[PDB]
Amino acid sequence: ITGTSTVGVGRGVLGDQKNINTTYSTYYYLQDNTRGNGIFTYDAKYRTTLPGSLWADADNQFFASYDAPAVDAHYYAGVTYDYYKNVHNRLSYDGNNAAIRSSVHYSQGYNNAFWNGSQMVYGDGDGQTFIPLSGGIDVVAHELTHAVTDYTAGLIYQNESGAINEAISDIFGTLVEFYANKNPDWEIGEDVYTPGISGDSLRSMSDPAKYGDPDHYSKRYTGTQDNGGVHINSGIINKAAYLISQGGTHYGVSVVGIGRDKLGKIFYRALTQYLTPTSNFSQLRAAAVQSATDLYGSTSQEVASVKQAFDAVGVK
Ligand SMILES: [Ca+2]
Ligand SMILES: [Ca+2]
Ligand SMILES: [Ca+2]
Ligand SMILES: [Ca+2]
Ligand SMILES: [Zn+2]
């Protein structure tokens, strides 16, 4: 980890060639010194001990199939860092250039990725439901966004607060996907989910109900599974964010879209200034309204569209 900054080349999970920032000191390590206090990628070696070994490579070429998840985790963490810095003037997830650490090859056949409070963790998938999860830029940015949330609003991962937490991660993951312009859409995880099946995804922001997630508050899940429905009830907020950006008419309520850039600015302000650990959906509405008011004025179209979007999903 002390060494010379250089640039290697590899291939990602989807077979695309990319340049990655590495560090040389006997080996070439997946350590990018160009962004904050660094981006570090580790090999968990199919175990669950974390973080594992800082990724070392002998020749600075990462074309082995074992390398692919590491290349993508490392590269997409950099892209996400760039988004937050360039678009929102935020230096890493803590606002003070905290090192970003990711471990890949976590466990065996593990169909998930997560932020654990310290670092990102990516399974390889079982090869049927998922391929290695770091192949999805929206997934990577979703996870890194959990770190942002943790250092700002601190939304508890239960019930409505947790659904907001999830939605925020889906929103910014999507916004990062659009920023990188990597075949962007309003779907989540499409690039790594069900390699055997075309056109699906884990979740949809444009139409959450496509996969049985609610798209209206009256359809919210109130049981105890999934921490009280954090990945299920996120669909209500996701639909609202999609409406704010893209517009549409939903359950008879019409929303004029104000586009992705303004969506991002509103939600980022809401997240960093107004939300608290126990914020519920109703408070999110107030926060988003206040945020749009701050940025664009109380008689703006932007404020009107935020109100319409939350009315469309039944959030008062
Ligand atoms: Ca190599
Ligand atoms: Ca996409
Ligand atoms: Ca996507
Ligand atoms: Ca698929
Ligand atoms: Zn999440």
Tab-separated table of C-alpha atoms and ligand atoms in Angstrom:
chain	number	residue	atom	x	y	z
A	1	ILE	CA	0.000	0.000	0.000
A	2	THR	CA	2.933	2.498	-0.087
A	3	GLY	CA	4.025	2.531	-3.744
A	4	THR	CA	3.810	4.121	-7.177
A	5	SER	CA	0.427	5.010	-8.700
A	6	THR	CA	-0.132	3.428	-12.078
A	7	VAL	CA	-2.842	2.268	-14.396
A	8	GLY	CA	-3.683	-1.289	-15.256
A	9	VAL	CA	-6.159	-2.838	-17.621
A	10	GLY	CA	-8.699	-5.569	-17.186
A	11	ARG	CA	-12.065	-6.943	-18.101
A	12	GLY	CA	-15.175	-6.686	-16.029
A	13	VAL	CA	-17.887	-9.170	-15.289
A	14	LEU	CA	-19.752	-8.360	-18.502
A	15	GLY	CA	-16.544	-8.799	-20.561
A	16	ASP	CA	-15.888	-5.059	-21.156
A	17	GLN	CA	-12.332	-3.766	-21.083
A	18	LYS	CA	-11.486	-0.957	-18.682
A	19	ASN	CA	-8.499	0.870	-17.230
A	20	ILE	CA	-8.170	0.767	-13.457
A	21	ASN	CA	-5.988	2.720	-11.047
A	22	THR	CA	-3.506	0.495	-9.305
A	23	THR	CA	-0.521	0.877	-7.005
A	24	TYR	CA	2.803	-0.800	-7.611
A	25	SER	CA	5.036	-2.128	-4.875
A	26	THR	CA	6.468	-5.500	-5.908
A	27	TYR	CA	2.933	-6.443	-6.870
A	28	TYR	CA	0.301	-4.292	-8.505
A	29	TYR	CA	-2.489	-3.737	-6.008
A	30	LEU	CA	-6.090	-2.671	-6.465
A	31	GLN	CA	-5.469	0.563	-4.686
A	32	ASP	CA	-6.490	3.765	-6.393
A	33	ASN	CA	-4.602	6.718	-4.946
A	34	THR	CA	-6.269	9.271	-7.210
A	35	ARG	CA	-9.528	9.570	-5.238
A	36	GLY	CA	-9.563	10.820	-1.641
A	37	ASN	CA	-7.688	8.626	0.789
A	38	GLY	CA	-7.991	5.814	-1.726
A	39	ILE	CA	-10.144	3.056	-3.057
A	40	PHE	CA	-9.055	-0.386	-2.014
A	41	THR	CA	-10.351	-3.677	-3.321
A	42	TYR	CA	-9.873	-6.950	-1.473
A	43	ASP	CA	-10.136	-10.654	-2.182
A	44	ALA	CA	-12.315	-12.480	0.336
A	45	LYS	CA	-11.266	-15.792	-1.304
A	46	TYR	CA	-14.723	-17.375	-0.989
A	47	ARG	CA	-14.651	-16.896	2.798
A	48	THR	CA	-16.737	-14.663	5.028
A	49	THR	CA	-13.830	-13.103	6.932
A	50	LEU	CA	-13.476	-9.472	6.029
A	51	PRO	CA	-11.941	-7.623	4.390
A	52	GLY	CA	-9.614	-10.395	3.222
A	53	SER	CA	-6.396	-9.654	1.258
A	54	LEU	CA	-5.713	-6.439	-0.593
A	55	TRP	CA	-5.918	-7.534	-4.202
A	56	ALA	CA	-2.423	-8.228	-5.566
A	57	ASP	CA	-1.621	-8.995	-9.163
A	58	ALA	CA	1.758	-9.754	-10.672
A	59	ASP	CA	1.535	-7.961	-14.042
A	60	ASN	CA	-1.147	-5.178	-13.847
A	61	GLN	CA	-3.359	-7.037	-16.318
A	62	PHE	CA	-6.668	-8.283	-14.955
A	63	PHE	CA	-8.155	-10.546	-17.648
A	64	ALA	CA	-8.617	-13.734	-15.598
A	65	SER	CA	-12.215	-14.635	-14.885
A	66	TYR	CA	-11.383	-14.605	-11.128
A	67	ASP	CA	-10.310	-10.940	-11.591
A	68	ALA	CA	-13.523	-9.661	-13.213
A	69	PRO	CA	-15.535	-8.874	-10.020
A	70	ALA	CA	-12.531	-7.067	-8.542
A	71	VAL	CA	-12.056	-4.940	-11.645
A	72	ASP	CA	-15.704	-3.833	-11.601
A	73	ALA	CA	-15.932	-3.242	-7.841
A	74	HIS	CA	-12.772	-1.134	-8.052
A	75	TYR	CA	-13.758	0.783	-11.164
A	76	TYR	CA	-17.378	1.406	-10.229
A	77	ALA	CA	-16.421	2.586	-6.746
A	78	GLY	CA	-14.284	5.218	-8.536
A	79	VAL	CA	-17.167	6.237	-10.781
A	80	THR	CA	-19.465	6.576	-7.762
A	81	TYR	CA	-16.837	8.646	-5.923
A	82	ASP	CA	-16.619	10.860	-9.008
A	83	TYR	CA	-20.398	11.320	-9.173
A	84	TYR	CA	-20.612	12.444	-5.600
A	85	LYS	CA	-17.611	14.746	-5.878
A	86	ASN	CA	-18.477	16.291	-9.222
A	87	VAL	CA	-22.253	16.536	-8.926
A	88	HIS	CA	-22.769	17.080	-5.202
A	89	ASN	CA	-19.429	18.422	-3.938
A	90	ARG	CA	-19.136	15.488	-1.565
A	91	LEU	CA	-15.735	13.978	-0.849
A	92	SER	CA	-16.310	10.268	-0.365
A	93	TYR	CA	-19.120	8.910	1.786
A	94	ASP	CA	-18.186	10.752	4.966
A	95	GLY	CA	-17.597	14.101	3.250
A	96	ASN	CA	-13.945	13.964	4.333
A	97	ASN	CA	-12.461	11.580	1.721
A	98	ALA	CA	-12.754	8.346	3.713
A	99	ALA	CA	-11.096	5.380	2.044
A	100	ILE	CA	-13.523	3.187	0.191
A	101	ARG	CA	-13.028	-0.506	0.665
A	102	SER	CA	-14.715	-3.365	-1.155
A	103	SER	CA	-14.310	-7.115	-0.848
A	104	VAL	CA	-15.279	-9.432	-3.677
A	105	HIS	CA	-15.557	-13.231	-3.841
A	106	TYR	CA	-17.418	-13.136	-0.547
A	107	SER	CA	-18.556	-16.574	0.500
A	108	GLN	CA	-19.693	-19.139	-2.086
A	109	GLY	CA	-22.687	-18.739	-4.321
A	110	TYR	CA	-23.726	-15.617	-2.416
A	111	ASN	CA	-26.582	-13.794	-4.126
A	112	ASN	CA	-26.143	-10.420	-2.485
A	113	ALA	CA	-24.003	-7.360	-1.994
A	114	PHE	CA	-24.064	-5.029	0.984
A	115	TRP	CA	-22.573	-2.182	2.922
A	116	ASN	CA	-21.725	-3.467	6.374
A	117	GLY	CA	-21.049	-0.136	8.124
A	118	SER	CA	-17.309	-0.197	7.238
A	119	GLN	CA	-17.036	-1.495	3.669
A	120	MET	CA	-18.835	-2.896	0.663
A	121	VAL	CA	-19.099	-6.646	0.176
A	122	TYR	CA	-19.975	-8.452	-3.054
A	123	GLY	CA	-20.944	-12.054	-3.566
A	124	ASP	CA	-20.272	-13.883	-6.849
A	125	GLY	CA	-23.874	-15.005	-7.162
A	126	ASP	CA	-24.797	-18.624	-7.830
A	127	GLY	CA	-24.508	-18.122	-11.617
A	128	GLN	CA	-28.282	-18.561	-12.157
A	129	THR	CA	-30.015	-15.901	-10.043
A	130	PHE	CA	-26.998	-13.577	-10.148
A	131	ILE	CA	-23.577	-13.229	-11.638
A	132	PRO	CA	-20.974	-11.287	-9.566
A	133	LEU	CA	-22.846	-8.366	-8.156
A	134	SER	CA	-20.131	-5.777	-8.691
A	135	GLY	CA	-20.859	-6.038	-12.438
A	136	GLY	CA	-23.820	-3.721	-11.892
A	137	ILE	CA	-22.940	-0.078	-11.577
A	138	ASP	CA	-26.343	0.577	-10.024
A	139	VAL	CA	-25.644	-2.108	-7.395
A	140	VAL	CA	-22.230	-0.677	-6.537
A	141	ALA	CA	-23.589	2.848	-6.284
A	142	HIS	CA	-26.567	1.537	-4.252
A	143	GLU	CA	-24.182	0.043	-1.700
A	144	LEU	CA	-21.910	3.065	-1.546
A	145	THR	CA	-24.984	5.247	-1.103
A	146	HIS	CA	-25.783	3.279	2.092
A	147	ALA	CA	-22.479	4.628	3.403
A	148	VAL	CA	-23.533	8.186	2.491
A	149	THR	CA	-26.842	7.665	4.306
A	150	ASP	CA	-25.089	6.243	7.363
A	151	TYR	CA	-22.896	9.373	7.701
A	152	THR	CA	-25.763	11.804	7.085
A	153	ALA	CA	-29.403	11.080	7.892
A	154	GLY	CA	-28.574	7.731	9.540
A	155	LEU	CA	-31.920	6.204	8.578
A	156	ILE	CA	-32.559	3.129	10.738
A	157	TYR	CA	-32.863	-0.003	8.604
A	158	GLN	CA	-36.388	-0.956	9.712
A	159	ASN	CA	-39.953	-0.029	8.675
A	160	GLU	CA	-40.487	3.240	6.838
A	161	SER	CA	-37.094	4.677	7.746
A	162	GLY	CA	-35.440	1.629	6.235
A	163	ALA	CA	-37.558	1.746	3.088
A	164	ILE	CA	-36.411	5.357	2.625
A	165	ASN	CA	-32.860	4.189	3.189
A	166	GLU	CA	-33.291	1.566	0.443
A	167	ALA	CA	-35.018	3.967	-1.930
A	168	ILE	CA	-32.262	6.548	-1.517
A	169	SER	CA	-29.774	3.827	-2.491
A	170	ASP	CA	-31.868	2.892	-5.564
A	171	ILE	CA	-32.314	6.524	-6.567
A	172	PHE	CA	-28.635	7.428	-6.378
A	173	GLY	CA	-27.599	4.085	-7.829
A	174	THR	CA	-29.754	4.897	-10.843
A	175	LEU	CA	-28.428	8.468	-10.995
A	176	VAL	CA	-24.904	7.090	-11.035
A	177	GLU	CA	-25.857	4.676	-13.815
A	178	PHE	CA	-27.081	7.669	-15.850
A	179	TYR	CA	-23.984	9.720	-14.987
A	180	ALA	CA	-21.699	6.973	-16.292
A	181	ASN	CA	-24.067	6.577	-19.235
A	182	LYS	CA	-23.758	2.754	-19.002
A	183	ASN	CA	-27.032	1.771	-20.809
A	184	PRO	CA	-29.003	3.668	-18.168
A	185	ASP	CA	-32.522	2.802	-17.079
A	186	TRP	CA	-34.834	3.032	-14.065
A	187	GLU	CA	-34.379	-0.630	-13.230
A	188	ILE	CA	-32.155	-2.021	-10.519
A	189	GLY	CA	-29.614	-4.818	-10.977
A	190	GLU	CA	-30.545	-5.640	-14.584
A	191	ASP	CA	-26.951	-6.204	-15.604
A	192	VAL	CA	-26.270	-8.911	-13.022
A	193	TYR	CA	-29.639	-10.514	-12.373
A	194	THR	CA	-30.769	-13.776	-14.052
A	195	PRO	CA	-28.170	-14.072	-16.813
A	196	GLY	CA	-30.485	-16.652	-18.418
A	197	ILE	CA	-33.418	-14.183	-18.717
A	198	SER	CA	-33.527	-11.007	-20.812
A	199	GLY	CA	-35.279	-7.773	-19.881
A	200	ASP	CA	-35.825	-8.357	-16.146
A	201	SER	CA	-34.284	-6.838	-13.011
A	202	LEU	CA	-34.404	-7.085	-9.237
A	203	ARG	CA	-36.578	-4.017	-8.813
A	204	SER	CA	-38.167	-1.414	-11.057
A	205	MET	CA	-38.383	2.269	-10.200
A	206	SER	CA	-40.569	3.025	-13.230
A	207	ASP	CA	-43.042	0.298	-12.375
A	208	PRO	CA	-42.337	-1.344	-9.006
A	209	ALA	CA	-45.520	-3.447	-9.337
A	210	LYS	CA	-43.937	-5.318	-12.250
A	211	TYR	CA	-42.206	-7.482	-9.587
A	212	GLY	CA	-44.972	-7.205	-7.001
A	213	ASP	CA	-43.604	-4.211	-5.113
A	214	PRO	CA	-46.048	-1.501	-4.046
A	215	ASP	CA	-46.435	1.669	-6.066
A	216	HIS	CA	-48.852	3.366	-3.698
A	217	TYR	CA	-48.903	3.849	0.057
A	218	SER	CA	-52.263	2.054	0.312
A	219	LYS	CA	-50.408	-1.091	-0.876
A	220	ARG	CA	-47.583	-0.864	1.635
A	221	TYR	CA	-46.393	-3.999	3.377
A	222	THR	CA	-46.937	-3.909	7.146
A	223	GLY	CA	-45.586	-7.293	8.310
A	224	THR	CA	-42.204	-8.174	9.713
A	225	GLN	CA	-40.324	-9.879	6.822
A	226	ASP	CA	-37.356	-7.971	5.338
A	227	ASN	CA	-37.006	-5.709	8.371
A	228	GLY	CA	-40.590	-4.596	7.930
A	229	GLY	CA	-40.421	-4.429	4.105
A	230	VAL	CA	-37.393	-2.201	3.462
A	231	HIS	CA	-36.841	-3.621	-0.039
A	232	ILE	CA	-40.606	-3.869	-0.705
A	233	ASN	CA	-41.947	-0.481	0.468
A	234	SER	CA	-39.008	1.291	-1.152
A	235	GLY	CA	-41.032	0.878	-4.321
A	236	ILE	CA	-43.431	3.618	-3.160
A	237	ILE	CA	-40.605	6.132	-2.880
A	238	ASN	CA	-38.874	4.863	-6.009
A	239	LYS	CA	-42.040	5.479	-8.023
A	240	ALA	CA	-42.319	8.958	-6.557
A	241	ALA	CA	-38.709	9.743	-7.499
A	242	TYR	CA	-39.254	8.357	-11.000
A	243	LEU	CA	-42.373	10.568	-11.327
A	244	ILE	CA	-40.487	13.641	-10.141
A	245	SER	CA	-37.808	13.097	-12.765
A	246	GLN	CA	-39.734	11.661	-15.712
A	247	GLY	CA	-43.304	12.789	-15.094
A	248	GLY	CA	-46.384	10.740	-15.795
A	249	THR	CA	-49.862	10.116	-14.564
A	250	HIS	CA	-50.187	7.568	-11.808
A	251	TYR	CA	-53.477	6.549	-10.203
A	252	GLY	CA	-55.045	9.534	-11.950
A	253	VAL	CA	-52.534	12.069	-10.604
A	254	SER	CA	-50.415	13.877	-13.208
A	255	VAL	CA	-46.839	14.896	-12.511
A	256	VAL	CA	-44.729	17.159	-14.667
A	257	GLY	CA	-41.204	15.778	-14.694
A	258	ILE	CA	-38.315	18.115	-13.776
A	259	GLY	CA	-35.537	15.738	-14.827
A	260	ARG	CA	-32.778	13.695	-13.150
A	261	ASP	CA	-30.390	16.507	-12.216
A	262	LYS	CA	-33.029	18.311	-10.170
A	263	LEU	CA	-34.222	15.028	-8.680
A	264	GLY	CA	-30.690	14.390	-7.473
A	265	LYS	CA	-30.247	17.865	-6.071
A	266	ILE	CA	-33.555	17.691	-4.177
A	267	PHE	CA	-32.997	14.241	-2.699
A	268	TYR	CA	-29.370	14.934	-1.812
A	269	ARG	CA	-30.388	18.087	0.040
A	270	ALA	CA	-33.200	16.196	1.758
A	271	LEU	CA	-30.794	13.438	2.795
A	272	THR	CA	-28.010	15.685	4.049
A	273	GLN	CA	-30.024	18.495	5.636
A	274	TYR	CA	-33.451	17.331	6.734
A	275	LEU	CA	-33.815	13.598	7.185
A	276	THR	CA	-33.132	11.990	10.541
A	277	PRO	CA	-32.710	8.383	11.670
A	278	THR	CA	-36.454	7.863	12.342
A	279	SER	CA	-37.844	9.761	9.353
A	280	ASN	CA	-41.008	8.221	7.941
A	281	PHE	CA	-42.499	8.682	4.454
A	282	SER	CA	-44.574	11.664	5.495
A	283	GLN	CA	-41.439	13.341	6.818
A	284	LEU	CA	-39.598	12.486	3.615
A	285	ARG	CA	-42.286	14.346	1.704
A	286	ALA	CA	-41.848	17.391	3.959
A	287	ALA	CA	-38.086	17.169	3.561
A	288	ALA	CA	-38.268	16.913	-0.206
A	289	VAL	CA	-40.718	19.784	-0.393
A	290	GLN	CA	-38.522	21.954	1.826
A	291	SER	CA	-35.474	20.980	-0.235
A	292	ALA	CA	-37.084	21.935	-3.523
A	293	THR	CA	-38.316	25.149	-1.792
A	294	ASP	CA	-34.738	25.976	-0.701
A	295	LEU	CA	-33.332	25.401	-4.157
A	296	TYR	CA	-36.053	26.656	-6.499
A	297	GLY	CA	-38.548	28.720	-4.437
A	298	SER	CA	-41.965	27.903	-2.984
A	299	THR	CA	-43.923	28.797	-6.142
A	300	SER	CA	-41.619	26.828	-8.466
A	301	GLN	CA	-42.641	24.052	-10.799
A	302	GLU	CA	-40.060	21.937	-8.939
A	303	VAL	CA	-41.949	22.212	-5.652
A	304	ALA	CA	-45.260	21.531	-7.424
A	305	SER	CA	-43.907	18.382	-9.064
A	306	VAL	CA	-42.555	17.035	-5.771
A	307	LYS	CA	-45.982	17.521	-4.203
A	308	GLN	CA	-47.790	15.934	-7.146
A	309	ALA	CA	-45.421	12.904	-7.113
A	310	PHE	CA	-45.985	12.187	-3.420
A	311	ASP	CA	-49.731	12.725	-3.853
A	312	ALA	CA	-49.595	10.255	-6.763
A	313	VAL	CA	-48.154	7.565	-4.471
A	314	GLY	CA	-50.494	8.438	-1.637
A	315	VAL	CA	-47.953	9.971	0.757
A	316	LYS	CA	-49.317	12.894	2.786
B	1	CA	CA	-2.634	-10.352	-13.884
B	2	CA	CA	-28.790	-0.358	-17.191
B	3	CA	CA	-30.166	-0.035	-13.729
B	4	CA	CA	-31.765	-11.127	-16.348
B	5	ZN	ZN	-29.687	-1.501	0.027
